[PDB]
């Protein structure tokens, strides 16, 4: 007999949900049954007990039951995503988008979820919009974008529509909670490889456990100057997920000859002047940018290296930041997003 | 100040700066909180266990905007006998027996909202639904009055809502007995939660209040018979941790389930059988926790003794019984709200 007084009660003595508890939860949730009241101490009460992966695992579950899908046999069992939570506070230019986009380029299919800025300046969906790529195509379309273009982008608010009780509560609550971390877990296209960021260092290893249990080979990151992204100015600390197991390593960008960065000489502006920023990178701009989309855009490859059980960690961060590197230098990277742009024209 | 702000901190597991319970409190009773963000705030606050000062914040801000009674109606040794739930019978009983005793009692609460029950006082014919004028007069000519929460805190309405969507208790449990609209500063204050117990009491130092915040050692919201309460006795700003047993004053231990309060007309019927002389663990309860609220009234002096104080207040409650002054109170009270 689950209800809101068992549930948040549980929550409020510090104590973990029993099974499906959460799963409940968040389906009261979607469904549009929860009162704002309910939804908002619900998010806080787990924030504060300290969510678990089961936990986290079953509300990313409910959000992926309710979810549109993308059509069947559409994505390559080996695509990426590069997403973060945000909320890192920094309004840097856009790295996962950045990232993404060479990715691609690089020959590794990519379906990124995204969504506009919580509380920066742009986010990667404002940015893709100021480029002129198209952020409101639906599954079908999207499938197309990826077969045709070799990216997909999974607008957050037209494939999870039923998540709007949801967003409006944590707009008005303002303080992250759980919640926060549900974007990057919810990519409706499902795929099983990706560079992860994580703002909030002590839910990150939460985050990791729910890919574990996936079965994903993802990297979730955290930059030790707070980014969800890794980072130049400093050491990330990464939750390296494979095998359905989770293992906890520091990364210094220095160990690959990255000089260190300012977190300054990466921030962001408004939605045109990110967009202007894509733009420097992929026309070759050298910089404290360039360095970390390209360290960004090795690591998701690194990822997608990490589907195989053969994949080596050094060996793969050399290849991810040659190919990576390459994509953006030939070329490809700027072509790429050109052709995508041509692409969303063309519908 | 900002509810990112202050929900962060609280997220943070850290206690809040001065005034910011006091700005989230006040957000809340202007109608300016969304209810996500009263939901939050009652759940964060409760997470992060409340201090005192935080609890006194909150109460202060809400009595800022209550409706007062009119002046000088209140008189300075009026007595407040209630508990935060968990024995609404108990408290009930136990004001009617204190007020017949002559000690004036003010009680404040909602139905079973700022402390529930008052359904018990509705189903013995007691109209608890009236403004400051009226309460004052009932004060004066009966003894005994009763402020009606949604009445004296209508800005609360936001706040109350909010606590039944989420059904589990929370901070707000905590602040009925500090934002009785009277502010008796005397009373006797059960507590369910042994440490929220000790934070009650904190609240009452602070305000110079004569108080027992009593808490029974078997969870009861008031002086038990089952077992051993602890007693947190506030007096001249000052606490002091104390374990009571009724065995010392010859009260045979009972069962809980003997003590526990049910619905208005259940506890009606028992008020009434009670008051009409019924012997037994009831009675027992009623008689010692009316006597712990004139141990308090009496600590309104600083030449009052304990084991003393508790002698003459268990002599005078079982007095107001035993003649029938208990049950005549009732009966005028009733009357009372028939006459206006
Ligand atoms: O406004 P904030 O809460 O700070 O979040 C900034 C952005 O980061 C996240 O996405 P993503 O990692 O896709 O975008 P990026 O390209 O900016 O890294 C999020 O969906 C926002 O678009
Ligand atoms: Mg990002
Ligand atoms: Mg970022």
Redesign the interface.
Same mark, same amino acid.
Request: proline share 11%; aromatic share 4%.
């Given at each position: 007999v689950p209800?809101?007084?068992q549930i948040?009660?549980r929550l409020?003595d510090?104590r973990d949900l029993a099974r499906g508890q959460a799963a409940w939860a968040m389906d009261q949730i979607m469904t549009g049954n929860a009162?704002? =009241?309910? $939804? @908002? @101490?619900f =998010?806080? =009460?787990m &924030?504060?007990?300290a969510p678990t992966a089961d936990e986290v695992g079953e509300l990313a579950g409910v959000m992926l039951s309710h979810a549109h899908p993308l059509p069947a046999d559409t994505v390559p069992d080996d695509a990426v995503d590069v997403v973060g939570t945000g909320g890192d506070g920094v309004n840097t230019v856009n790295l996962s988008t950045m990232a993404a986009i060479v990715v691609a380029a690089a020959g590794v299919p990519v379906v990124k979820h995204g969504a506009r800025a919580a509380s920066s300046l742009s986010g990667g969906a404002d940015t893709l919009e100021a480029l002129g790529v198209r952020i409101d195509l639906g599954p079908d379309l999207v499938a197309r974008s990826l077969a045709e273009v070799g990216i997909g982008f999974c607008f957050a608010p037209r494939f999870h529509p039923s998540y709007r009780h949801a967003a =409006?509560?944590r707009r008005? $609550?303002?303080?992250? &909670?759980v919640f926060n971390l549900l974007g990057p877990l919810t990519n409706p296209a499902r795929p099983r490889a990706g560079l992860i960021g994580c703002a909030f260092a002590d839910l990150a290893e939460v985050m990791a456990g729910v890919f574990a249990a996936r079965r994903s080979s993802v990297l979730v990151v955290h930059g030790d100057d707070g980014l969800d992204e890794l980072t130049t100015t400093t050491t990330s600390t990464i939750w390296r997920v494979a095998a359905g197991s989770v293992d906890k390593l520091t990364f210094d960008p220095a160990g690959f000859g990255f000089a260190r960065a300012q977190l300054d000489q990466l921030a962001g502006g408004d939605a045109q002047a990110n967009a202007a920023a894509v733009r420097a990178v992929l026309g070759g701009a050298r910089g404290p940018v360039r360095d970390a989309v390209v360290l960004n855009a090795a690591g998701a490859i690194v990822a997608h290296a990490g589907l195989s059980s053969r994949a080596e960690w050094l060996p793969a961060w050399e290849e991810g930041l040659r190919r990576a590197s390459a994509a953006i230098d030939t070329g490809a990277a700027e072509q790429l997003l050109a052709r995508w742009v041509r692409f969303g024209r063309q519908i």
């Open positions: 209800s809101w007084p948040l009660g409020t510090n009162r704002p =009241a309910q $939804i @908002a @101490a =998010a806080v =009460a &924030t504060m007990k =409006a509560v008005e $609550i303002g303080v992250p &909670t």
